[PDB]
UniProtKB/Swiss-Prot annotation:
Residues 1-228 are annotated as: TOG 4. The gene is CKAP5. It is found in: Cytoplasm, Cytoskeleton, Microtubule organizing center, Centrosome; Cytoplasm, Cytoskeleton, Spindle pole; Cytoplasm, Cytoskeleton, Spindle; Chromosome, Centromere, Kinetochore. Interacts with TACC1. Interacts with SLAIN2 and SLAIN1. Interacts with HNRNPA2B1. Interacts with TACC3 independently of clathrin. Interacts with TACC3 and clathrin forming the TACC3/ch-TOG/clathrin complex located at spindle inter-microtubules bridges. Interacts with NDC80; indicative for an association with the NDC80 complex. This is Cytoskeleton-associated protein 5. Belongs to the TOG/XMAP215 family. Binds to the plus end of microtubules and regulates microtubule dynamics and microtubule organization. Acts as a processive microtubule polymerase. Promotes cytoplasmic microtubule nucleation and elongation. Plays a major role in organizing spindle poles. In spindle formation protects kinetochore microtubules from depolymerization by KIF2C and has an essential role in centrosomal microtubule assembly independently of KIF2C activity. Contributes to centrosome integrity. It comes from the Eukaryota. The chain holds residues 853 to 1080 of 2032 of the full protein.
Length: 228
């Protein structure tokens, strides 16, 4: 079977990963990468590792954010579909890294959520309020990347996205975002939202907008109704 590595996740190791000295944090993360690669395939119980890694997704040293993202990629491949058990606790915090100002860090975060989605499908990622609460944030890097990801994943869903409607008010915010790339990605995503929600549901959601915003969004909606 797969190897259980929970007993490798010791108090000593978790303590190193959270140390105040980056060299000791790095030593801890280096060890974790080695443990997973040597096991190759692992059981889903990874002790307190998720708490330790969540704590490094905003490390002051960007190389340790990158190292943590690579370890999260290892975990998806090594654990397989059982990594679904960790999506809400550990996967969603990866989404916040799409808001990094460093292009190479954002790129690694996107690759990481895609590596997980290959194992888990998109259902857990789109369920409930968690993703919409990230899209809500006025970070143009986060909005851009998340809208791009939605446009790519929405036509491939194996389960109806129950809570896609929760993203809609923030999608509409993005249609008028200050950032032009955000506006472009929101426009790209619009028809893929509509394929699941339908026009009337999306048109109803414009009620909460100010009259000027409501007017432009409805016009964008009419045009996407061509592709229906």
């Amino acid at each position: 079977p797969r190897t259980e590595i929970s007993d490798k996740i010791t108090s000593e190791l978790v303590s190193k990963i959270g140390d105040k000295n980056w060299k000791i944090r790095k030593e801890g993360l280096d060890e974790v990468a080695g443990i997973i690669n040597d096991a190759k395939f692992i059981q889903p119980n990874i002790g307190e590792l998720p708490t330790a890694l969540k704590g490094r997704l905003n490390d002051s040293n960007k190389i340790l954010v990158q190292q943590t993202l690579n370890i999260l990629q290892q975990l998806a491949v090594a654990m397989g579909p059982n990594i679904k058990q960790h999506v809400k606790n550990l996967g969603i915090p990866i989404i916040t890294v799409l808001g990094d100002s460093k292009n190479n860090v954002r790129a690694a975060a996107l690759a990481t959520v895609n590596a997980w989605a290959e194992q888990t499908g998109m259902k857990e990622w789109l369920e409930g309020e968690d993703l919409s609460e990230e899209l809500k944030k006025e970070n143009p890097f986060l909005r851009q990347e998340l809208l791009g990801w939605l446009a790519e994943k929405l036509p491939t869903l194996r389960s109806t996205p129950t809570d896609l409607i929760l993203c809609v008010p923030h999608l509409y915010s993005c249609l008028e975002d200050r950032n032009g790339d955000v506006r472009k990605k929101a426009q790209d995503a619009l028809p893929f939202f509509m394929m699941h929600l339908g026009y009337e549901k999306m048109a109803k959601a414009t009620g909460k907008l100010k009259p000027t915003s409501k007017d432009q969004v409805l016009a964008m909606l009419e045009k996407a109704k061509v592709n229906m």
